[PDB]
Amino acid sequence: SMSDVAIVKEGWLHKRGEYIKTWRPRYFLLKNDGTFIGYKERPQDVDQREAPLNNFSVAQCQLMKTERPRPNTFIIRCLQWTTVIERTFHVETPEEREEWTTAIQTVADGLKKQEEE
Numbered sequence: 001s002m003s004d005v006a007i008v009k010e011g012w013l014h015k016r017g018e019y020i021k022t023w024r025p026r027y028f029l030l031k032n033d034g035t036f037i038g039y040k041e042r043p044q045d046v047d048q049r050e051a052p053l054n055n056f057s058v059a060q061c062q063l064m065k066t067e068r069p070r071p072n073t074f075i076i077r078c079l080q081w082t083t084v085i086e087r088t089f090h091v092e093t094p095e096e097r098e099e100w101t102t103a104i105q106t107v108a109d110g111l112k113k114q115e116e117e
């Protein structure tokens with residue numbers, strides 16, 4: 001129960017709009033249960049934590065590193081209920097990008113091992 005809701009990684013990034021393709025600052029949090037949740041403002045209390053702006057599930061996701069429109073961009077391709085979506089993110093160095101994509105992949109792998117169990 002508690003290991004599943006551990007926070008694996010959290011931090012700020014920019015998230016690109018889907019239609020108005022601007023970079024928007026968002027605070028994201030990845031948990032062992034595959035939830036990847038974003039906030040306009042970094043949450044300061046539990047109530048704030050419970051009300052994210054963005055919520056994805058990273059089970060079986062794909063992780064793509066790209067250099068356009070900006071270097072150090074990454075794309076997650078994941079399932080949102082029954083629709084496959086892509087979301088685009090940016091951090092300021094390739095090392096930071098690798099930290100995020102590896103953490104997301106580690107969580108996804110964990111969920112897969114749980115299934116296989």
Ligand SMILES: O=P(O)(O)O[C@H]1[C@H](O)[C@@H](OP(=O)(O)O)[C@H](OP(=O)(O)O)[C@@H](OP(=O)(O)O)[C@H]1O
Pocket residue numbers: 015016017018019020021024026053054055087
């Ligand atoms: O603002 P524009 O360019 O019109 O497009 C919006 C933003 O990309 C939202 O991201 P953000 O909340 O980070 O601004 C996104 O929310 P999600 O990424 O949470 O899905 C909306 O998807 P919808 O969820 O389909 O509304 C999408 O329609």
